[PDB]
PDB file of C-alpha atoms in Angstrom:
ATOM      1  CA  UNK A   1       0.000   0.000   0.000  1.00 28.63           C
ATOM      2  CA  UNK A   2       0.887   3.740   0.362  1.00 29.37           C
ATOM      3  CA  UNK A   3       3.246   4.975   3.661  1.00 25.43           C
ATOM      4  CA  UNK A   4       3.867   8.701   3.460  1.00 24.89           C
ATOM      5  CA  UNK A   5       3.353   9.687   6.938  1.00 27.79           C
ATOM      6  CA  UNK A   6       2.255   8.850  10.124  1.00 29.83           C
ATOM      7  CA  UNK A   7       4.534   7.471  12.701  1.00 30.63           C
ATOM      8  CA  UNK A   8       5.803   4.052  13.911  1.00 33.18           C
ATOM      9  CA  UNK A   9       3.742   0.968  14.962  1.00 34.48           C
ATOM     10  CA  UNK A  10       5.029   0.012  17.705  1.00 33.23           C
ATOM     11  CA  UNK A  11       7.485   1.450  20.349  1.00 31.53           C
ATOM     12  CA  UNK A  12       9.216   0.431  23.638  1.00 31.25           C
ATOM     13  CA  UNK A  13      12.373   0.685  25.537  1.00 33.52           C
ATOM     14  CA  UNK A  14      14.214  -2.828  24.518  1.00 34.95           C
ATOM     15  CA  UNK A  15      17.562  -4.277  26.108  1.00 33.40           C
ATOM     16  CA  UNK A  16      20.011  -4.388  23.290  1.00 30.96           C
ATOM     17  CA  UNK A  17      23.010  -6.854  23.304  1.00 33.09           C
ATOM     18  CA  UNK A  18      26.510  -4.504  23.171  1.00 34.89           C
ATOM     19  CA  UNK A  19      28.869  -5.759  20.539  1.00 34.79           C
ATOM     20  CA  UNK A  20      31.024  -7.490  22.365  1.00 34.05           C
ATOM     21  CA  UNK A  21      30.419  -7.238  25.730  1.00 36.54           C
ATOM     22  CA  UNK A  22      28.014  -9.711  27.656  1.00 36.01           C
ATOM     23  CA  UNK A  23      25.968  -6.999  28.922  1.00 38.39           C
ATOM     24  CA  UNK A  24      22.772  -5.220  27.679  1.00 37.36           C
ATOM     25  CA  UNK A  25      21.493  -1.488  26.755  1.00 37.98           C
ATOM     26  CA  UNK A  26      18.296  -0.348  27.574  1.00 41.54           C
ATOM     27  CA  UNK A  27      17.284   1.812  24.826  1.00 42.13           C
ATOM     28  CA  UNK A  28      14.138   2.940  22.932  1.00 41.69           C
ATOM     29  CA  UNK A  29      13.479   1.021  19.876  1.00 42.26           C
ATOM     30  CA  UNK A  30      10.711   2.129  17.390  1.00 42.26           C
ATOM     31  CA  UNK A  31       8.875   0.834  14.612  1.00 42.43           C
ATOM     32  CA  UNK A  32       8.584   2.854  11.225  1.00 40.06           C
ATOM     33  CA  UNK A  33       7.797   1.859   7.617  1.00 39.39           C
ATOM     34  CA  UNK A  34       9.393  -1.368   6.980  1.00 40.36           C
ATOM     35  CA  UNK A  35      12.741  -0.630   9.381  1.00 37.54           C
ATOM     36  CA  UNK A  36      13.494  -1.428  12.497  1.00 35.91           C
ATOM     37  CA  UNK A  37      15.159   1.638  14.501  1.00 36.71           C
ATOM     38  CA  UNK A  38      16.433   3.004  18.198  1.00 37.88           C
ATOM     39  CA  UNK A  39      17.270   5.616  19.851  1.00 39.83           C
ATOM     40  CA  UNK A  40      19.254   6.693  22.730  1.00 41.62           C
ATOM     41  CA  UNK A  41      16.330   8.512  24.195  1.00 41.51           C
ATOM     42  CA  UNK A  42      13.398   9.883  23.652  1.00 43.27           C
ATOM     43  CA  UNK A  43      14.301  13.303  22.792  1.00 44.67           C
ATOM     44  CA  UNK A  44      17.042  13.072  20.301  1.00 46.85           C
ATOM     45  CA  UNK A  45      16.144  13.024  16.453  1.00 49.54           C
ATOM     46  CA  UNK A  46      18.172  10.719  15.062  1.00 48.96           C
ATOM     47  CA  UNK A  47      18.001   7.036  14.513  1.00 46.60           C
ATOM     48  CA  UNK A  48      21.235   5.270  15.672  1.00 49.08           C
ATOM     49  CA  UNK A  49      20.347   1.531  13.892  1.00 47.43           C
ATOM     50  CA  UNK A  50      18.429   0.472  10.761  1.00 49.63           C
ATOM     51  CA  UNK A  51      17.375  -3.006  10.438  1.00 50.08           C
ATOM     52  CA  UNK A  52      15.736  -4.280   7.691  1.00 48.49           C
ATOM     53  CA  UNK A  53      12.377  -6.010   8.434  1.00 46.33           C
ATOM     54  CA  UNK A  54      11.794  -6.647   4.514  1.00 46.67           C
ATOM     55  CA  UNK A  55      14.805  -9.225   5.054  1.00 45.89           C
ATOM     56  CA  UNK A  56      15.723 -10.143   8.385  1.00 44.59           C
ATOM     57  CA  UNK A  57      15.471 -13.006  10.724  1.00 44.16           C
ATOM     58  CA  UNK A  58      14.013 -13.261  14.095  1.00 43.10           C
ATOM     59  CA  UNK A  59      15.270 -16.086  16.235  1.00 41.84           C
ATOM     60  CA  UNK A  60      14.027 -16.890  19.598  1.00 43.47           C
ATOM     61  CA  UNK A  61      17.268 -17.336  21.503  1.00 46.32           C
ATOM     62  CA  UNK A  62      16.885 -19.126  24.969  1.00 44.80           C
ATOM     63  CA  UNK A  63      19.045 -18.195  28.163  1.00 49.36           C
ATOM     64  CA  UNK A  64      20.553 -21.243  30.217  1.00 46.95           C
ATOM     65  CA  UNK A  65      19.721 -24.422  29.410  1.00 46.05           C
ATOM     66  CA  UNK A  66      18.055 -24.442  32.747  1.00 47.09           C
ATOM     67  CA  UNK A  67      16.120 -22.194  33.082  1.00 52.43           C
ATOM     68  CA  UNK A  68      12.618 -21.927  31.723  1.00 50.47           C
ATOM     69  CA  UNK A  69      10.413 -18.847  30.519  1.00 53.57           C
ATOM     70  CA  UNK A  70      12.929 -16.422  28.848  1.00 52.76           C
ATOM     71  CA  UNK A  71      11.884 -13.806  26.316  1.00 53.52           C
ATOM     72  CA  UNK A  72      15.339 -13.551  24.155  1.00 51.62           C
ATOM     73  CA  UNK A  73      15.133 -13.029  20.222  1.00 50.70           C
ATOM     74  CA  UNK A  74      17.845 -11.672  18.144  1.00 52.81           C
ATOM     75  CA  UNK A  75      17.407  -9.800  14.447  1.00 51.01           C
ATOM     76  CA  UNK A  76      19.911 -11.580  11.849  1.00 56.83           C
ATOM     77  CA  UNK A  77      20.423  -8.493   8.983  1.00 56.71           C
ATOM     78  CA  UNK A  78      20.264 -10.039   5.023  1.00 58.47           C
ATOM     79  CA  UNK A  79      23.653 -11.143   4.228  1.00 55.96           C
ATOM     80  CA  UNK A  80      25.447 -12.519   6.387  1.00 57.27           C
ATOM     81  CA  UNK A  81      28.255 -15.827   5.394  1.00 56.87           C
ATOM     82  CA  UNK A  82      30.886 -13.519   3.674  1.00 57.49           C
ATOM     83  CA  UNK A  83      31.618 -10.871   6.108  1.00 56.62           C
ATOM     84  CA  UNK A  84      35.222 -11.672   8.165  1.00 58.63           C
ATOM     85  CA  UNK A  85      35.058  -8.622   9.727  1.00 57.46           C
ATOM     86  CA  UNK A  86      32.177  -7.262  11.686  1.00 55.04           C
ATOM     87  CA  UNK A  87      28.007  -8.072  11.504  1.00 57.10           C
ATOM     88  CA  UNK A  88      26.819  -9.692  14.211  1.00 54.14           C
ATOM     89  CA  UNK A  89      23.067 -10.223  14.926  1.00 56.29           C
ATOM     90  CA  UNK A  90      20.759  -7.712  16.593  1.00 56.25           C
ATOM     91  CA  UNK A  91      20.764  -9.101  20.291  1.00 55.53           C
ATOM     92  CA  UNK A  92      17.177  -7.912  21.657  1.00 55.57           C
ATOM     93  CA  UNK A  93      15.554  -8.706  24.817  1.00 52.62           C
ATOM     94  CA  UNK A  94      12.052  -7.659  26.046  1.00 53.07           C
ATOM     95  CA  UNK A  95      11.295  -7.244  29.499  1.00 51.00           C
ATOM     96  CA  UNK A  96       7.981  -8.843  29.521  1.00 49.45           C
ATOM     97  CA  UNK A  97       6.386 -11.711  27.110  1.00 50.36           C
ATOM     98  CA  UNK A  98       3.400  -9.474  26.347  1.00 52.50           C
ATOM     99  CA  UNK A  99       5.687  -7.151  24.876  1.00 55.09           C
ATOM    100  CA  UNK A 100       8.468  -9.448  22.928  1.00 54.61           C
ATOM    101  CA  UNK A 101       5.328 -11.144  21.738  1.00 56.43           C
ATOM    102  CA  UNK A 102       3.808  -8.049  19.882  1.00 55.40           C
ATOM    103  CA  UNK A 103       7.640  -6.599  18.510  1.00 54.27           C
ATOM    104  CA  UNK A 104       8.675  -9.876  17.275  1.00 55.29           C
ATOM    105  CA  UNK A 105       5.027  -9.928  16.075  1.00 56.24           C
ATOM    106  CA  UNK A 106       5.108  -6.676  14.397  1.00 52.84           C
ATOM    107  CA  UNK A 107       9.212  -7.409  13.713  1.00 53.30           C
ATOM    108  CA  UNK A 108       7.969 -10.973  12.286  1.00 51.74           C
ATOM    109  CA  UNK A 109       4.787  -9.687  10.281  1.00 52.96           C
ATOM    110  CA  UNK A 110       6.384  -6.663   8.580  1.00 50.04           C
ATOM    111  CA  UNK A 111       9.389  -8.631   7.720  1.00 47.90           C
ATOM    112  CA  UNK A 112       6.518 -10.872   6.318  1.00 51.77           C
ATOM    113  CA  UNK A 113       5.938  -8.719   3.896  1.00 53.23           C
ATOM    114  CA  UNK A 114       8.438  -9.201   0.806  1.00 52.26           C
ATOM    115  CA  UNK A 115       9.020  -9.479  -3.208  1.00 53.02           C
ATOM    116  CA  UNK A 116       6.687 -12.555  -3.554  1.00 50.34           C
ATOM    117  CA  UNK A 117       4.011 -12.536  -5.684  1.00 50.66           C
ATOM    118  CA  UNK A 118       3.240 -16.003  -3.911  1.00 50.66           C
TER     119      UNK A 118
END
């Protein structure tokens, strides 16, 4: 269909996986258009990451073996097999089901959505 304007679809502050560091960053991720973006805060204008829905991957990724109920899911960007150097996954965490349910949902659905007439 058409997307001029309007604003996201969904928003929330979502626990982001550092690059290399086994610790996470709470920051405000929204959802615009068909791309995946988040911010520092909620004031600043500018979108640090841009993840393509329209060819991503969402994978439910599970804490300790363990353990039981975790809501883990990382975003794995198109290409991704030739690059020695740096592209790692996006590492998100939700703090609540409810909420990982609808942004992978969304995250999921959107990313749905691609060049297939069937």
């Amino acid at each position: 269909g058409s997307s001029g304007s309007s604003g996201p679809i969904k928003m929330g502050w979502l626990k982001k996986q550092r690059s290399i560091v086994k610790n996470w960053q709470q920051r405000y991720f929204v959802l615009r258009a068909q791309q995946l973006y988040y911010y520092k805060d909620e004031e600043d204008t500018k979108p640090q990451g841009c993840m393509y829905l329209p060819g991503c991957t969402i994978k439910e990724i599970a804490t300790n073996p363990e353990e039981a109920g975790k809501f883990v899911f990382e975003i794995i960007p198109a290409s991704w097999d030739q690059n020695r150097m740096g592209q790692d996954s996006y590492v998100l965490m939700a703090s609540s089901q409810a909420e990982m349910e609808e942004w992978v949902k969304f995250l999921r659905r959107v990313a749905g959505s691609g060049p297939s007439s069937g």
